[PDB]
Amino acid sequence: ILVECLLPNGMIVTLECLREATLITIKHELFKEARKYPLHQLLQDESSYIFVSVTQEAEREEFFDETRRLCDLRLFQPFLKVIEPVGNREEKILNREIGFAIGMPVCEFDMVKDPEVQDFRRNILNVCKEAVDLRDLNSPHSRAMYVYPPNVESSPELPKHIYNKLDKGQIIVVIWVIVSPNNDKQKYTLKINHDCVPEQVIAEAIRKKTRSMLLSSEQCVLEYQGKYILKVCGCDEYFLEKYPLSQYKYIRSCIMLGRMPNLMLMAKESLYSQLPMDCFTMPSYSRRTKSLWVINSALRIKILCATYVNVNIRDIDKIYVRTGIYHGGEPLCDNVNTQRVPCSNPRWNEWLNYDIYIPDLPRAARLCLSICSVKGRKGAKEEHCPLAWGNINLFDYTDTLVSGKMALNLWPVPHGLEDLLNPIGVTGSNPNKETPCLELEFDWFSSVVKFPDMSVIEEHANWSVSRESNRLAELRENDKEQLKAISTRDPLSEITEQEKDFLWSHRHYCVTIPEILPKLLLSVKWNSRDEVAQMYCLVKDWPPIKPEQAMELLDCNYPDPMVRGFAVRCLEKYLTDDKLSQYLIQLVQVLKYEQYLDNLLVRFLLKKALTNQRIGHFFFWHLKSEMHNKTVSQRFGLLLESYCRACGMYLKHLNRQVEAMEKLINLTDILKQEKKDETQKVQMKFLVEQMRRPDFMDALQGFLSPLNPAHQLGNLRLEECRIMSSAKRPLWLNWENPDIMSELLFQNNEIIFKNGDDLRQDMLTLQIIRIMENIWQNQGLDLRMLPYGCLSIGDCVGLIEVVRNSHTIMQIQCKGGLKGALQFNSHTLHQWLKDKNKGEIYDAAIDLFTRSCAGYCVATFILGIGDRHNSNIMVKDDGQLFHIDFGHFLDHKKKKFGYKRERVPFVLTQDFLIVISKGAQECTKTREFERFQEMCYKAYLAIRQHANLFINLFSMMLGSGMPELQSFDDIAYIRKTLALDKTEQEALEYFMKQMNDAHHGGWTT
Template identity: 40%
Template sequence: SCLIQGRQKVPFWPTEMNNNKIISSMYGFNERALAGINPDRSYPTIELEFPSYKYQIATLQPRNGLAMQAQTKNEQLLRSCAFQDDLEETGENIIQSDFYDWLRSIEFELTEQSRVELWDRRYECMRVPESLPRWLKCVKWSNRDDVLEAYKIIENWPTKNIDPLMTALELLDVDYPDPFVRFSAVRLLDTRIDDDRLLPVILQIVQAVKNEPYHDSALARFLLRRSLLNQQVGHYFYWHSRAELKNPQYKVRYGLLLEAYLRYCGEYVEDLGRQVRSVDKLIYIAEIIQNSTHDELYNQKGYLAHVLTREGYTQNLQYFRSPVDYNIELGQLVLDHCRIMSSARRPLWLRWTNGSEYAEHYFPTFDLIFKNGDDLRQDMLALQFIQMIDIIWKADGLDLSLLPYGCLATDNCSGLIEVVKNAKTIMNIQKLGGLKGQFQFDASALYRWIAKNNPGADKLKSAIDLFTRSCAGYCVITYVLGVADRHPDNIMVNERGQLFHIDFGHILGNFKMKYGIRRERTQLVLIDDFVRVIINNNSTEKNPIETREFKNFKKLCIKGYRILRRQYRQIVCLFKLMMNCDLTELNSEADMAYLRQTFAIDIGANEQEACDRFEQVLLESYRSSVKTRVDWVFHALNHIKS
């Protein structure tokens, strides 16, 4: 990096407004602490003049040796705190234990008084290794001696017993701009995290590049190195970075990264070229269809086939690797199964044959939905969050059979969605039960559909178990994540009995309103149709809540919720790294306040109190399921009208 010289024009960042009041933050008016100047020249600008020199003056990147310049006083104490075994139970140590519990607590909040205490007890903090990100917030970064002391402590901080991935992600947040801190985070990733653990969070790591003060950073070099060494990592790095090229604030940074990657990725650049040409053609086709008249769309299937078979189109839409899933090779388009969907943006449902030479041992076809005009980055975030929750639960011995299907935003207004095989929406399943099922008068349609697809006592028992676990998992997820717009077209079940949710356009408690009234009056969906399957259609019991099967379902829900609450810091970290995406429902700290509510942190509840509160929400959602059914009746009526 080079020292700025001469006259520079610096446009201001816009202020954040809420109810015509200016919202300030710890970053001033730059709410999200964006690196660099505002590229929008329409805002007020100031002109600064810096001293000019004969030569360019470059700064050196921080290295490990920089930390060793720190003062050596208290070095013995520092080392003893880093490596000392468990303390003896004395009165003083009990007080220290309270201090350590506070450092670990999810209710941790930093005040001016606690900042001073954390700095004074900085060596003791090393006995709680996972507290490093919290401790760094107490450092006075404007004081050179304190900064050097902090560097020394970071170098000696014990990292053996911490989660290196989550610690690194926290340190790559916008709250930690210091280059040496960020270098230490990247070092954790590079030395402790393999590619298998890196892939589920590659989206957040690519977004963290926005928080770097300079284009050339340790994180950028790490991403390039891993992408060039592993083609699968490179695949997702490329597409997540390419989605940011239309963002004027970051297009230069990501453009430089992509140029460096494409120059050295070898033959894979040809694969990426075919994928990009295919996506560009799909965007062009989608725009043609969106601008078509009703007369032209009278025979939608024939019209789409005509557009897809135009000269130059078919060649670019066949035999390329799926952008959504690196492991899938798409073959020929199956025109008979391609169609225009009925929603406002007229998405395209497309089917390809399996282009792999081992196709006979796998699925013969793959279906993808292409959307143009919709921002799929929020859906992608929600599905990646579900994938991470699945990893967290399985690491704790809990398998709730989640189904995070593939979704990729190719830019900020288009993308591809994987179609789950052999699955139907709840709406379509209820339609099979006739008007009674469609208008919520028959709660057994779902059970009969699952039983029909799983004949025999053993298969049906397995399907019900799968439904119970997956329903429990998505009850917890939709509650914690605040997923809204849960109508019967946004919940699906496959033939094996596995339930899953789709369409995450509204999250974090942004529930839809109609005439000032919230359309969804329960915090999660648990209707009679679901409970009928969970209790195996056992109608002999007067109250389904008292059945053994429902109690087991409730235990699964509470256990899943308890595990997630313990991982609150990790969940917040994953969301916070996405704040610079300019998503409508996630662009400031205030948008994440919903997570504090769902985990009962805002009211200071302990773990058991929070679990009891969630249990009440679960039971109340079932008791009030008639409200959900009324909403679904109106949805069915609107569907018939359209």
């Protein structure tokens, strides 16, 4: 490459440098040819200089790491400048690694003048300190505990339906001891109780080993050596904690499937040396009046002008600014509009007046506003359409009321949004300056105005009752029943004014029913000072509640900091690691509902992600997948920078995964755009040419799988990598497993790379399916679902786990002959199931098929996923059936094309019924069919009994950006599909009627 080089003496030299050349060679040959040019004697020594240049990301990144290659620098232009080092080398090396991991440079954080951002950067380091220090407290044990956390479940108690799978409460395990003189491996079958801790398992394994190994006659103290640990064969899972063996996820899954639990006996010191020290250091940037309740004036905000709006003068007549004071999604007063002005001169200079006093403003009060246009004209006038929107916190992060001039840059209206205002949306100005900007003025009250401290608020309570129709103040039993009845209601139930007044009038007895707190919080008028003070006094001493219900308090309906702090404390004291892992997506999503960067929830999440690497991996990937969206780019970037600073040497693995995903993204973007007008074979030849280069091979081999960090992806098998002919241009990639004994788990790991389709809907659907399966298995129903792995890594790009030995129904019906009008006898599925397993395993195959089919029928009907055909449903060899390619949910394909109420997505065709009825010509009148119907009914009722959790989980993704989830009206679909307003009997009847109306079969009792 014709790189032109800049020497410090004004010397300019052209140096021909190879693309695969390290910076050491570049420096050496740069000073080698620096002798034939003018002023060479004045040049200093070669080792006292470094390379600085500009990258494609528009920063001047000094090249303190000379081991990098020329192409990896991402140069904007092929040039290098020779300078002298001025700062700390390792700090900038770490900063560059963080910048690569994050997707944007660290320095542009330092170039931010918002005091909140710098305060967050300085203050999150304390949590980083505590996490890193706790991780190092008991080295080397705590370090391995952090790197390889136990994959256990919440409770050691064993469900009764699988305790009977045990042989008298005992487990068969196969322990593999790799003595390896060269490679030799042995096995030891053992019989132990399900509740033994791994120390006892190791003790019994060594007892078996020290009985017949290298001796057959008698000759520390032969028991409890303590020098070994347990490892799952074929993957990076370890049993390092004192838990019952059945509590580990791998063991209990083996019990579920009746498989053979394979384990290994590694040495303690080998694993301890397998992981390095964490050298975490603080960076450079760590080196560093009247109350609101004394202002007797109604709130008013001036709207000065707007710089520009993008409308046409021949279509839009006039424009106006519509404002409103909100607490969450609930207005605190009526909305106020400005006057109507022509679009050419958007100047108002108007003092808007609001119907709320200043001391009555809640701490989380926000001003929401939008520029809107009025079409009008003709008889049907008043056609309003918003153009831009924005929200401002009326208090800053230091509890100070806004004052003075303020310039706000607004955001584009989200797709499929009709309401004039957008209170759900995030706060803050648009970082882009080529946007409509609205100038506002706030009142100046001769000093700085602060929200009152908790002490004076507590003073206000216990006094408000003295001054002052059953509110504003031994409790009858008919009231007690009413409180419980309200408590059992779903969070999106109808709450009447009478019910709200009843709840508030009995707030001092609501404490004995701790689960009623969300309703009581929705029953207080947040525009009243004394009511909020009393609510604060109640929340201060509220009994703890379950994480299931405390998570509900973190959605957009409860913006008050005290309520969110109570919810975060409940999460701190009750939420387990596996439950946190199951619910991490929603907890990440509800970070956007926080008004300030430094909050208790972000501290709790970062502390958890720095003490548990499994949690931290998905934390990083969930934050990184939505760095493209500018509404959350800064907050997520700051949080991710802190995490990457304090994570340790997991940053190298994360960096490797980022390079792999970037190379895959570039390849898919090339083949999906330049090769639209091409056949698949030439694309495949091109693609194997692309993997032929050593650079892409090195980038795509030897890194941890983002879907499961415990899985290592070794070399790429190019003979088994292909481009699918399905929708978009997905990539089938096959990796070898570098584990010593991959044959026990799986030899090959296969992942689909999809570029073009959103995967957040699929991720949410699979999470819901996994939760449904867990509820069913705990209830006593063995409905086995297959919630395969799916991860979104960026904007419309993600990874999908592949299930081996699976075929679509179309694949079977095509491989079994017949075509088109030839009905395949509707027996091809049953014939294939008979063929692929025969004998005594046949009955188990139909049993598994029936249970999985029932589970998926109930789940698909409840979630309202897109219509199912023979190409998005797959069945394994053993009989298990599962759905793929979820796409949409809650209809959302209908509701715009028409009415299409409560459609059944997965209708049982005849082909499935003959499988369930085991070859019976008539299927609906058999005992198998009614057993299947009973299983479906029980699954539906079991899910209905846990409707609150599903409603709450759906309510946390409202601000995520999925078009299916923009308001609670979208969750009304779930509310009505479970018949939540009806009672249990009519809900069961409604489900049977729904199944009848799509089958015309025997779905009536």
